[PDB]
Amino acid sequence: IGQRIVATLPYIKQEVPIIIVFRALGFVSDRDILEHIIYDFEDPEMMEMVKPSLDEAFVIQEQNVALNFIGSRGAKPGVTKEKRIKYAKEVLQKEMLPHVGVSDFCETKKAYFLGYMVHRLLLAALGRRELDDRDHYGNKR
Amino acid sequence: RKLRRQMDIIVSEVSMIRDIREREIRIYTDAGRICRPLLIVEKQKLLLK
Amino acid sequence: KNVTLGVPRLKELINISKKPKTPSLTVFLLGQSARDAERAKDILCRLEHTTLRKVTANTAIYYDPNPQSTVVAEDQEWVNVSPWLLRVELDRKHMTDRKLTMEQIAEKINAGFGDDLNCIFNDDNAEKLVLRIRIMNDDDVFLRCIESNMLTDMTLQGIEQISKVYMHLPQTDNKKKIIITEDGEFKALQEWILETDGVSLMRV
Amino acid sequence: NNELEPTPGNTLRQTFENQVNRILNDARDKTGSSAQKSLSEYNNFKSMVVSGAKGSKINISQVIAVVGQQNVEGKRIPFGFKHRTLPHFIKDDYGP
Amino acid sequence: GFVGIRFCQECNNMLYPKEDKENRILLYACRNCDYQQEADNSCIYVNKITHEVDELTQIIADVSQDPTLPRTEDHPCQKCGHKEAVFFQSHSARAEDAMRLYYVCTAPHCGHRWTE
Amino acid sequence: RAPSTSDSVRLKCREMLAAALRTGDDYIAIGADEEELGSQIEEAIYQEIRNTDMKYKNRVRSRISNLKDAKNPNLRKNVLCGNIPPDLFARMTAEEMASDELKEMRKNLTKEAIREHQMAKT
Ligand SMILES: [Zn+2]
Numbered sequence A: 001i002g003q004r005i006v007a008t009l010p011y012i013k014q015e016v017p018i019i020i021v022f023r024a025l026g027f028v029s030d031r032d033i034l035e036h037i038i039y040d041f042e043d044p045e046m047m048e049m050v051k052p053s054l055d056e057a058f059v060i061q062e063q064n065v066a067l068n069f070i071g072s073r074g075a076k077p078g079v080t081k082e083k084r085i086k087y088a089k090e091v092l093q094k095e096m097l098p099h100v101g102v103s104d105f106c107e108t109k110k111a112y113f114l115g116y117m118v119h120r121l122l123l124a125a126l127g128r129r130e131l132d133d134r135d136h137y138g139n140k141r
Numbered sequence B: 001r002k003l004r005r006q007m008d009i010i011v012s013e014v015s016m017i018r019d020i021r022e023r024e025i026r027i028y029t030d031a032g033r034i035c036r037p038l039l040i041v042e043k044q045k046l047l048l049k
Numbered sequence C: 001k002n003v004t005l006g007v008p009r010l011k012e013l014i015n016i017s018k019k020p021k022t023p024s025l026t027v028f029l030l031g032q033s034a035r036d037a038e039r040a041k042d043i044l045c046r047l048e049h050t051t052l053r054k055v056t057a058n059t060a061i062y063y064d065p066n067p068q069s070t071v072v073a074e075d076q077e078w079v080n081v082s083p084w085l086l087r088v089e090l091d092r093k094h095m096t097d098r099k100l101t102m103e104q105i106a107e108k109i110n111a112g113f114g115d116d117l118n119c120i121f122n123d124d125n126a127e128k129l130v131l132r133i134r135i136m137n138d139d140d141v142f143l144r145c146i147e148s149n150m151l152t153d154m155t156l157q158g159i160e161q162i163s164k165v166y167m168h169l170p171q172t173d174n175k176k177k178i179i180i181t182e183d184g185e186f187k188a189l190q191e192w193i194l195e196t197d198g199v200s201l202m203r204v
Numbered sequence D: 001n002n003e004l005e006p007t008p009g010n011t012l013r014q015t016f017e018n019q020v021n022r023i024l025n026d027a028r029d030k031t032g033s034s035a036q037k038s039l040s041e042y043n044n045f046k047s048m049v050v051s052g053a054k055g056s057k058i059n060i061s062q063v064i065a066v067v068g069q070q071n072v073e074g075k076r077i078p079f080g081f082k083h084r085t086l087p088h089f090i091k092d093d094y095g096p
Numbered sequence E: 001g002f003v004g005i006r007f008c009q010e011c012n013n014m015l016y017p018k019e020d021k022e023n024r025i026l027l028y029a030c031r032n033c034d035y036q037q038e039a040d041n042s043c044i045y046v047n048k049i050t051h052e053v054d055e056l057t058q059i060i061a062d063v064s065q066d067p068t069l070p071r072t073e074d075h076p077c078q079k080c081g082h083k084e085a086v087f088f089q090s091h092s093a094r095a096e097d098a099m100r101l102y103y104v105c106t107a108p109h110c111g112h113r114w115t116e
Numbered sequence F: 001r002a003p004s005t006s007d008s009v010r011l012k013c014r015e016m017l018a019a020a021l022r023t024g025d026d027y028i029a030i031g032a033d034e035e036e037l038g039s040q041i042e043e044a045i046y047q048e049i050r051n052t053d054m055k056y057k058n059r060v061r062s063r064i065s066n067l068k069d070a071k072n073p074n075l076r077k078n079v080l081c082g083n084i085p086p087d088l089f090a091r092m093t094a095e096e097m098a099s100d101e102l103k104e105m106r107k108n109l110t111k112e113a114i115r116e117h118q119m120a121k122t
């Protein structure tokens, strides 16, 4: 098995697996997530690599349970399910990815950006795209 | 590229990078990038005359 | 190859580190095997670590319920006499390099996994060497779990911690064998020696 | 053209680099030896080298014959850019 | 050749395999609903240890219109007969022993690629 | 010179080996008592092993596969023609001798190649 894709959210004391993050955005459906991540369903080696960190996440399906799962690990976790849900929702809408947009709703593009990150990670893993160089000043300001 | 070389809407500071191995096009307009001027070759001659 | 000489080696020697950067062993062959590389590579294979993943070419799991159905063309099942198997084919060249044979690979698998699994092996004569492994007594994924937990760490042949072994003829006279002749000269000799990449020093 | 037999114990890239480095080192050594043979008895580099006061024959070779091959971490110049060492070169060039 | 992926039609979910303990027929079932389907592949999971897979699948024909790539006239195109075609190596990792060049015809709307 | 036995598994192996000898029409061309030969090989294997365990069954299966394989009918030819004694074929080991010339050649060349593949150290 092994090879589980996870995330390290800001102001969250513990890492969380990815599919819980996607469902926290409200993507309860499963085909939507893989559409966001995999842009072509014809290469089996690419698509099989998400199964490890997809079978790890079948307990959580609804949005509220995902938000509570996130909030249980917050910097100041709530004492009520409403507190956990609102805290996790606020930290996702504000702290996570301000550059894509902090408008009233940005899930339609935040999900695509997370999918792009995961797709890049899988591309690096499969060897279809070499790693980035820290010394290259195209990557510096 | 043509609009930047005419310098009408895209200022000369903007850099357009197109990747071909992966179909991406990247555009940067932020501060801090380091750039130097260079001559332009059209086919095999110079635009400098 | 790499030996990491210089100041880092001095630090490793001064600060006695339970793990160095590049531990290795120089092995001298005792008998006539030190002279013919053919009878030294067998020792090399007896030394180097070899798991199942080193020899496997392709692997696949099928749901063939009827044993005589044989979803793939394999006449061996009929003469040999869970509804799913685990067909494993082995690369021929790697299989021969270790001077190994499937009849004992199956015995290793059976000894490792008890009676939970039953392995059927193709004969050496056939061009394609295959292994039909069937569990007999949530088991759909159990084959995947075991194969991911036996292919990597099986230890078909050799000893652990020895990543690779180099057969080498020394050029300098320091490692060359020295024997005083009958009339009294020194007459340095050249014999095969080996350089591992791990440390056992006891099984070796 | 895939007509390169891998050297015992070496990958294809490793043996390719081995032949390349061997050829380049042979060229450097031969040119240096020719330069040493060319020097006169009144030359000052030769006088200060043979006495061991300063310098060595490699310095004479680099001043006269050829500087040689540069390396970082014991290998030739790495592909700092994408599949090339400088913008003035062309992708996947392993020439001297 | 490979194991495909089938999606549940009701709730848009992965279809897990499920052997029929009575009919001895492999079937695909969801988990969020009592959905069943007939499995025709007769395969579950394959794995190629060698991983020596051809890379022509992802060789985009857009590579031809690139100015920083070599151009040669030694191996012309087979069909259109164009005399010039760019070439490049694996351009990817995992290559145990790869020095061959994957050619692409430098012709508009040709896309002819081959390995030598 | 095959003493008949009473063990059912032994006779099953004998008849399977005999039917294996029926492949390739070599027995028809020669005209020999292949059943007697099968009994002799089974008895020789039993003498070598002194048991009826996994080794018995896998050795019999290996011999059957070697005999009935059509890629090397020469071994069947020269075992039914009396070129090789039955006992030596019984004590035959693996494939290094009961093989065609092409497989022996490819094994030899891969053995020679692994020399260089395992030298290293410049
Ligand atoms: Zn469903």
Ligand SMILES: [Zn+2]
Binding pocket: E077, E078, E079, E080, E081, E082, E105, E106, E107, E110, E111, E112
């Ligand atoms: Zn063309």
